[PDB]
Amino acid sequence: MTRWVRGIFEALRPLETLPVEGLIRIWAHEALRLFQDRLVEDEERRWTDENIDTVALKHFPNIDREKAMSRPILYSNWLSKDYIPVDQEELRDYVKARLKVFYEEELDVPLVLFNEVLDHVLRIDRIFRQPQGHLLLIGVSGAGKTTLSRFVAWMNGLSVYQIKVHRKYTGEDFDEDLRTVLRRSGCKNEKIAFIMDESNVLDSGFLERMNTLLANGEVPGLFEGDEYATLMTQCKEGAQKEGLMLDSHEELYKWFTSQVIRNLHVVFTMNPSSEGLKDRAATSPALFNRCVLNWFGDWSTEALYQVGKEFTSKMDLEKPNYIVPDYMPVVYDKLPQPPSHREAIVNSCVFVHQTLHQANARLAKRGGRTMAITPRHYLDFINHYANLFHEKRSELEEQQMHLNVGLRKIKETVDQVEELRRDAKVNRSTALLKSLSAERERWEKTSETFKNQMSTIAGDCLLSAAFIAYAGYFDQQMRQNLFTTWSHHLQQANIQFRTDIARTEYLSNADERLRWQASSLPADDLCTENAIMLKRFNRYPLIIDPSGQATEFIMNEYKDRKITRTSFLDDAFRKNLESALRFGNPLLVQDVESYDPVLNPVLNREVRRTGGRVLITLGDQDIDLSPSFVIFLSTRDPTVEFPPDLCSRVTFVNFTVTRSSLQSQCLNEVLKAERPDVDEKRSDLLKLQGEFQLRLRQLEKSLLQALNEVKGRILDDDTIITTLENLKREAAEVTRKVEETDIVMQEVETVSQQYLPLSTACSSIYFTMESLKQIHFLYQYSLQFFLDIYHNVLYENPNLK
Amino acid sequence: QDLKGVWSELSKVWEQIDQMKEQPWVSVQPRKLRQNLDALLNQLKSFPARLRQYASYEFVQRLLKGYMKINMLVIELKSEALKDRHWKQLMKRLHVNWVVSELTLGQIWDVDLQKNEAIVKDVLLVAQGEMALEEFLKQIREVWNTYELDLVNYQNKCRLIRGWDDLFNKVKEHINSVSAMKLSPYYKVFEEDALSWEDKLNRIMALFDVWIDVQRRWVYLEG
């Protein structure tokens, strides 16, 4: 309440004539900025918002509550001066202009201005423009804490200064940094926005000094001895600059204290944790008394929708053929009606994010292990969506151009063979002409198929990106459930995507899978999908595996690139990091449960491109970065819990075997070793999604290359038609496969259903053996043991003979 | 007429383009270049639509738009990573003959940077790798010319050396980094310096490994 009074007085000082409505407006704005600022969930926020206006009307009748209490309550001194109330849109335009200028200065990564960012920018600016105006920020990682803090600090002229924590970060290092920042703030009269994350706040040794600095205004005893003498010596020059001649040591120390209090604002960024925040309160009260705290958690639906709209403006997503379905599935209430195709795609992206929230909450209710889902994952998802869309569109355009070139070449050769007929050979020439006409009609059909794929590309890429970015930590069954939910949603929205889409085939090709199988990567479907995850990533992948096949596979894959192994526990880890960070080689890292926060700059991909040099701030040391640097984090323990900070900077790759993964693996092995015809038909069905088509296109390219050697010699026997009969029978075979695909699907489904109980028995038996370790410590069994038993049953079985 | 007016405006725009291109590349500022490009674009947009429909105006507008989109490549090339060896190398690949002292933005704008984007980006990455290695060599030199032995008095009888652990960690860090630096093919440049530094580091390693044992035995037998 005393800060309430101070805020009202500060707002009323430059103004001289105010009706009662203005006073009530200022009072309500201060109530919003002091009480509802610190709340966590939506119900309490609504309670506070309604009670403020209820109290205002109860204790102040006869006034017009509309002007006095307006829902978009906002105050700023940027528009004109004197802390005048401002409408949201004018401030939006001003922030857009200043953010553009900021872009030309620093942090070229774009920002999307939804209402929440505007409010938080206003709050941070209000807190900064205040002596000893320290700030606490509580919110989920990636919500825009450090970015907005730095933006507001730069806007108000505050020079940001953030310490980089690492392993063996002794207290003396923080003492030296504190001395440096205090000298920079007080002595040189340079205002500082000092930003601290939670990684360095974990140790309680630093928090006591920071508590003293917060409360007293400057921690006593940080300067002592010759360093204290240098402090006073430079403080004399500081007083020289300001014309405040003083000679006694204590009085100039007090002047340094005043300068520090007036010119140092410290912003804390802390992840939401009830027990963690309780411990912080236990070790320090001034973090809640001296520091005013602002809560902003997960982005609202409007924020997600606006970010998706702004980050999908570059892509086409414009289908004039798209219609509006009846009962459009809307997760954003402010969608245009009727919506455009891009509108529907962004709505589907928002729905994907929200349904992953719902799935995570349900799995938490069930009692399993859950990983945090943050808006940084949403940005990663939208980046994967853009990249896959562009890549697939470029491939389709190149393939269509190749087909057009082939068609023109065939037309020219038809004209040439007509000219050569102008002059048994004639019958062969007629056969060649008919054959070329048939192949031309086939390429027209191929062009129609190209149009169909160009239609389905948008939804297919959306689902593929949603899988590659969001999922990865859940087991096979949960991945399938999420993919089915996304497919059903896109089916509701009339967004065209292939109904039998296969994730493994559309995100890779034959050569990559063959190379993976060359390394120690088993043909299990989970392993292939997670190899897909490992090939494409924006955030560095974190692999979890109780078996350790991941490490061998990933070292074999990158063995040609001088990959190295390193653990966190090894004291040379920083050592190895620096090497891999400058000489340009991948470095797989193990035992991530003992995570070292020193990797935070690397995972964040924050680099500084200055002086003809790219620099990474590895701890307190700046290191040259090489473009060929991919880092993989690994762990053998599969039940370990990760902090939300780590969970929001890496994509999880799960290799744990569950009741659904082993079931599918054993069913596939049964089909392969017992019904080879059914397994062959299933493989043909799976390869029909491009692989056969890719072979056909490669073969027609080979025909193009052979026909380019024509020179009249194409009529050696006047039938080069044998090669195109090979093509024609191959095309007839693939056409037959496509026509009868439904019958193949049905037969494979029936055979797999018949063989399923054996797979369920296999999974249950293996998990019973695995959980026998609780009966006695001697009963320890491995998955390879069960696979040996299973092979001894399937092969070398006398009874089956 | 209107054609004469648009021809005069085109001549003025071309004169402005030539004047900004006469600035030598040594004295060109990428940020100011981008600002001037934006100003020229704004000036072009101020022309009437009748003058804007002319083919020559469209050609100049698209040329300046190409300059705008390659401004990022100009910024990347305007590093110190380029040295002159990479400039010589790109000269050899692009088969152009320039003078480093007489180098200005004009000749390189005549060269299609967009068409040669792959080569330019390869040159940039090569330059960044070589600068990483050279900066590492500068760092090792400056730490190993400024490192001092931590001498401490002993019983008023001698002045022994402490801090063996930190010095040994530094030596092993540097020897392993240099040994791993043989890979990363960019090592083909600055190889004799690397070999000399490795030899010096190995000499330090052996000398101080013997030194620590001598000091320990001597202090024990002294006691």
Ligand SMILES: Nc1ncnc2c1ncn2[C@@H]1O[C@H](COP(=O)(O)OP(=O)(O)O)[C@@H](O)[C@H]1O
């Ligand atoms: N309004 C926004 N529009 C677009 N991107 C944003 C916005 N806010 C934050 N981001 C992105 O999300 C990230 C948020 O990081 P931040 O939350 O500051 O890290 P930390 O969780 O350590 O505080 C930034 O890298 C930024 O690129």
